[PDB]
Amino acid sequence: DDPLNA
Amino acid sequence: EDFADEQSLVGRFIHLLRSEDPDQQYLILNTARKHFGAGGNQRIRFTLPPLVFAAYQLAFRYKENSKVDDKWEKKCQKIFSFAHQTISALIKAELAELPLRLFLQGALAAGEIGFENHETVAYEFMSQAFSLYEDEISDSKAQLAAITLIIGTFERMKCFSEENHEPLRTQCALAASKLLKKPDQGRAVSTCAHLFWSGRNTDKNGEELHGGKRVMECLKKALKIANQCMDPSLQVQLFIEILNRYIYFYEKENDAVTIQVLNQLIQKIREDLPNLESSEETEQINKHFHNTLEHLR
Amino acid sequence: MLVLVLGDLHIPHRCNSLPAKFKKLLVPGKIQHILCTGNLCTKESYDYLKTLAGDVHIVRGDFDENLNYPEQKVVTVGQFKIGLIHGHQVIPWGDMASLALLQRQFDVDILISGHTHKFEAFEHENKFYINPGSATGAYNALETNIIPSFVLMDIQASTVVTYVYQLIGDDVKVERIEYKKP
Known part of the structure; x- marks a missing residue:
């Protein structure tokens, strides 16, 4: 779960 | 504005050109440079280099269509002749730093693709970069930055036979030992040691040269230049750099590097290091030697 | 604390802009530090x-x-x-x-290098090494299948978490590698 991940 | 508008005019024209299939892409790059060549000297600093990189990408694209198109080796010869003429147009505009680096990228691609008569193309591009380095560059930190690209580029090459690898090999060492300052000479000569060790020619079945004696000749010659240096800071700073260079080949199983050579240098650094000014420069030089000793332990 | 690691765009020499999905993710107000390897240009x-x-x-x-x-x-x-x-x-x-x-x-503790145009992230001799690769997926003479990629580091006290972002085809795909300082 990367902090961006849009 | 002429500078910025032209940087992004070809940038779009290269992204919009990937839509073109390889046979049509060449026809367009040829009319692109005809359009972008009318701009002038201070303009073509920013349009022609992207066309040269699009030329290198095109030659790789033809190698993908090797089994589909049997005239692909003639096409690659035509592109590198297009790039040679496009980069030569930048030299007439009184440039040296950029065309030299473009000629290095062309010799790299030619050796990687492998079309017929590619060794000659890679040699002409390399020798042309040497011509710009010798005839058009004379600033110690700009020379050092130019020759370290030539060496690093030549280090990765593997397409030259021994009859062509040896002149370039001894040309890099000659131009490195003749830089403007002794500290820059010591760095460039010690950097040339990777050419004799990890450089590949087409006579060894694709294997590395591993010339252990020549690897030492550079480092022995690099220490000689280090003694005659100019600043006791830069002198010891170069003594520690050459020490790590010995450790590199020592760990790469170079027979000619013995622990006696290492101990001779760590003692020489132990003697001259206290004879420096107390500064930020020599504090980092102290930590550098501390890390080197910690790695050897 | 989180850092963006990228470089080797080679605009306009080899590309023109980042991929569409990269420009959507990279927007202001969200990242504190940015470390660039060079070649913008x-x-x-x-x-x-x-x-x-x-x-x-x-x-x-x-x-x-x-x-x-x-x-x-x-x-x-x-x-x-x-x-x-x-x-x-x-x-x-x-x-x-x-x-x-x-x-x-x-x-x-961490060394950042970028010339390869190849993403790498690994520990060696209890030390960490990053190569974000070309964020634009620019041309490289020694590697023919360049994957446009950058790196996001999530630093917390004595632990770093690196996220590699890659444009594989049209999709953006993420992997995670973690490193703790000895």
Whole structure:
């Protein structure tokens, strides 16, 4: 779960 | 504005050109440079280099269509002749730093693709970069930055036979030992040691040269230049750099590097290091030697 | 604390802009620090980076026209002493022993190199090494299948978590590698 991940 | 508008005019024209299939892409790059060549000297600093990189990408694209198109080796010869003429147009505009680096990228691609008569193309591009380095560059930190690209580029090459690898090999060492300052000479000569060790020619079945004696000749010659240096800071700073260079080949199983050579240098650094000014420069030089000793332990 | 690691855009020499999905993810107000390996190679990409974060560090690439960029840089982010260099000065290119040689010189916990245009992230000799690759997926003569990629570091006290973002086809795909300082 990367902090961006849009 | 002429500078910025032209940087992004070809940038779009290269992204919009990937839509073109390889046979049509060449026809367009040829009319692109005809359009972008009318701009002038201070303009073509920013349009022609992207066309040269699009030329290198095109030659790789033809190698993908090797089994589909049997005239692909003639096409690659035509592109590198297009790039040679496009980069030569930048030299007439009184440039040296950029065309030299473009000629290095062309010799790299030619050796990687492998079309017929590619060794000659890679040699002409390399020798042309040497011509710009010798005839058009004379600033110690700009020379050092130019020759370290030539060496690093030549280090990765593997397409030259021994009859062509040896002149370039001894040309890099000659131009490195003749830089403007002794500290820059010591760095460039010690950097040339990777050419004799990890450089590949087409006579060894694709294997590395591993010339252990020549690897030492550079480092022995690099220490000689280090003694005659100019600043006791830069002198010891170069003594520690050459020490790590010995450790590199020592760990790469170079027979000619013995622990006696290492101990001779760590003692020489132990003697001259206290004879420096107390500064930020020599504090980092102290930590550098501390890390080197910690790695050897 | 989270850092963006990218470089080797080669705009406009080899590309024109980042991929569409990369420009959507990279938006201001979300990242604190940015460490760039170099090769932008113009102010048009610099000014775009300065609007993504306040603290942006850039070293000089082999095709950068701006001499004001330093050859290398050592910066501290939290507990980690991080060294920044483009990596065209590291001979042989992408060599492991030549990179660890520079880690001894800078005395850094993490070393950032970028010339390869190949993403790498690994631990060696209890030291961490990053290569974000070309964020634009730019042309490289020695590697033919370039994957546009950058790296996001999530630093917390004595632990770093690196996220690699890659454009594989049309999709953006993420992997995670973690490193703890000894």
